[PDB]
Amino acid sequence: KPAVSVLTMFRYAGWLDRLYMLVGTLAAIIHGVALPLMMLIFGDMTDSFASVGQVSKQSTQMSEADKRAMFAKLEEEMTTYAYYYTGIGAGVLIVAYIQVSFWCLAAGRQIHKIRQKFFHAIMNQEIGWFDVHDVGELNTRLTDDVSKINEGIGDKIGMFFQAMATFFGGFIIGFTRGWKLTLVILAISPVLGLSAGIWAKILSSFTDKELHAYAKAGAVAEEVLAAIRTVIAFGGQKKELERYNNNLEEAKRLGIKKAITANISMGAAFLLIYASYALAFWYGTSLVISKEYSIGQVLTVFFSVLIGAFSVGQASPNIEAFANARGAAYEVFKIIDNKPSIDSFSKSGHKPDNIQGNLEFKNIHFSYPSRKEVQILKGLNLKVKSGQTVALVGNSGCGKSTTVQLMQRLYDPLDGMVSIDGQDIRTINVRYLREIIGVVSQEPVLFATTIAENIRYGREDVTMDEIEKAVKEANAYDFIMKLPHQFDTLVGERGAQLSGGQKQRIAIARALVRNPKILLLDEATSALDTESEAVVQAALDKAREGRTTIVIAHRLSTVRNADVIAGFDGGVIVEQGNHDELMREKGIYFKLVMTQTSFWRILKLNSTEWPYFVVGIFCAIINGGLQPAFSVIFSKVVGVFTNGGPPETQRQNSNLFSLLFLILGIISFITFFLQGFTFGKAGEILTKRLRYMVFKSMLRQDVSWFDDPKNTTGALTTRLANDAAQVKGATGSRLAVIFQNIANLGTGIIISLIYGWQLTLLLLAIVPIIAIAGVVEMKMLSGQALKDKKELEGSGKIATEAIENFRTVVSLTREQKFETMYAQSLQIPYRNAMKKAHVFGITFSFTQAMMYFSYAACFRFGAYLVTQQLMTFENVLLVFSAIVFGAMAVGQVSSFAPDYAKATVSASHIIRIIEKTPEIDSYSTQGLKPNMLEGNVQFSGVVFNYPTRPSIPVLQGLSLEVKKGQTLALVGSSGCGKSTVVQLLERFYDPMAGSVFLDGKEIKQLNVQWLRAQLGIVSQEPILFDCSIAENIAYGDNSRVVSYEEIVRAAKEANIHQFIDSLPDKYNTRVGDKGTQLSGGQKQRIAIARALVRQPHILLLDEATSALDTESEKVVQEALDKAREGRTCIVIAHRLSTIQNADLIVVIQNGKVKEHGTHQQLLAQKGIYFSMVSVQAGAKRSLE
């Protein structure tokens, strides 16, 4: 929204910059005017051949006589025109170079200054300014916004003015050559302009707004893959796949509809373009027959005006470029223009000598920039004598730290004054104040350089001797000297991570090199190990004795030796004095003291449809064959009119052409819509097949794969959408266009080649060169782009280091250091940006000059050698068209290149994800399917390590046995060991060693589905999909539809019926947060219902009461208790009071069963279980 003035943005351009911009925009306007002048001569050429074209055919008597005057006229005229063209070429060359080079130079020269000034301004901000702002946003703002600004003031301006110049010049020549055709075309201008803009909007659809139509399936996919363990447990995979398939089924239909409409639109647009284009020309001919216009003039004005018309369209984007740049420059300059109160880059104020370090805080009221919300310091009074050391203590609020905060003048106080020696702190220079004050902070930071440098960040001028004495006086010498590389060792976030105390000591050394008169120590001893604490404490004590010191910490071991101790309450200073006095006071201090004591294989998948392709390619080849027919006509339109001879026959002939001229148009509506519709419908179907085959195979994989940190629901849904979205683009429109373009160039080149002898062979030498010359330029553009990104990446890295740790660097000053380093970092990209302008200009001008010089060789060879022969102009005009547009059609091959690459990378994954097979597949029909109902469960010598974390074993030699119709209670110290039983019985994993049986058969050889079909699993936080609760209950049994009275019975067994009959919708109510909300109790009871609607022989209750409270636990436990006792059961629940009735209790220890037996037996014994029960039991009594 907010923007910037035009003159302020360029404030950093002076002297040579303005000159570059002037000469640049000048040369640009010249370059702009250059083109329409080309089309102006083109009419004069037509008149030359037209004058001879009429006279040559008018004779029909003498032959040789026509070999004299005509050839001479063509000689002088063609030579003149060619000379001019050659003249234009050098011009466009020079002016192009000047333009792009100068503008790029200006841009670079400015942006450099912008960056430097901006970073300086960033560093110049006071801390209060940072406290209210996001640093990440600010740095990213730097790096991105400066780039936007760069894009804005760049060569884009030259292009804009050049476009405006083509616009004006085109319309000038257009009007001056004649007024009528221009206005007619100006009636055409809105018509066509309305068509082309819409066409472009239709093409751009590939970016993702696609969610609106698709997301319906994505929702199913997400809740499924989020619920994967539940759908796995209940084996409802076929259903989920079905749902997803249905949603896809809808999606494809919406897709083909969109395809139809879009194709119709594009076709209609093309028709409008055709019709108008032809109509204007027909009116032109209608004007030529009246002898009001020359045949060439028509061409001149037509092309000049249309040029002028589209110039606008291609001009517009540069406006937005300059537009965005102002808006970006706003927030940038805001910081540069911002002048703070504190500065610290300022040289001003007193720099006192012989500071004794007498400090006093007088009546200081303060609040951080949370402002009125909280006032932390209400009044204050404090003094500290020179050479003394004061210790600040407090219960909370950290008003203690506030003093150290203010003493550096990071903030100026609301009311009151802090006074160092006799003078107000605000009278003395900031930098000097900061330099006379040393600081040691709780969390020490070390910038990434050698230790020496970090010690050198104390003072820029220092010798290794001072470093040595400094670290040795901090007693950090030993620890670092033992380290390799000596002082040259590396430190930072990345690499050489050291002990906190060591880092603190290095910090103290850095502070010690500062040789400060004033020392501020804030909780530097705190948040550190007790052993190294004394080591660092020695240093801290040794860091004093030359200085006055204010210290703050939570450890009262260091306070006793302080000269004065100061307590705070609610921001109010209260207790002050020596230790004994404060202990005699028995106040806050005493209180705290006492308190602390080549893949075509996917193309083979599209081979499902043999048709729908041949149609589109045949049609698109016919379109490819239809395209140059447009050029053949235009040739003969101007051709017969030039070759006319007697005029009488012309009017009818020109009129029959303009008819036909349109006839290829209307037929172009049929063919274009076809090849777009066949390829489109073909695109939406395989998108169903792929996503269906991808998703399916994703439900095949076991839990082992879903536990992978590499694969998460979002990543899977993303991988699911993208690849399927991408492969469509490669097999889609692009291919059709390529075939259309090769067919286009092919038919074009056949016609051209068979008509012009060596006229075409010539062009085929020229055209592939300028095309390849066009591609290589884009390659150099990306190379310089990537290389530049890498260099500023290094300069942006030192900025991030500076502004993220900023609150430290301000304390140490040396911001100027980072200024200098940042500059030296920038210096390399700067010299690089100078070469950029030199290159960008040459590559541009070379490509323009080649196209203009090529245009000279065109008519020069077309005339002279060819026209001196019996070969004719009408063919020349045909060939140039045909060939050049064959080329401009080939350009789309280069333009469409990356799609296949991206699609290949995306098509690489999508096959792999299908071809991947699991260890345990739920799809296999193999496995025993025993006939015997009664379950038991045998765990024997089981060892299990989770595939994700094969470090700490959960299970080692676990062995369990539980008979039918009896409850197995499972207790454990902690961990998934209790759950892993339930996970392994469901067979999400096969254990590393050992084995598990049910009826005595090994489940490993058993059918997986049949196995999971007999299990009653109920988890902690049951996930219910969005659908009727009856459908969530009916989810308990698949491959069969559940009866109403059955889910009723199951609902009755689960005691949820109170809710279900209470709801307005009853069993048809929707749950899962889309249509309704329920608490954990209802959800759980539903889980119970779906558990026992399955009628399992084995119930598995995994911490069912985990998240729950009050009566809910009671009723749910009642339900669960009612659910069991008729079945085999394994209950791991954390309430042991509810396990007191269990057939077998088993205490798990380190993966081995430790204690096992009935409650009273484990109670008779005194051991782990007794403790487990004793700790939680009577805790209710402790709660009383």
Binding site: M39, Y277, L299, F303, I307, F310, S631, F634, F880
Partner: peptide, 6 residues
């Protein structure tokens, strides 16, 4: 598509 650019 004749000589200017169309």
């Amino acid at each position: 598509x004749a000589x200017a650019x169309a």
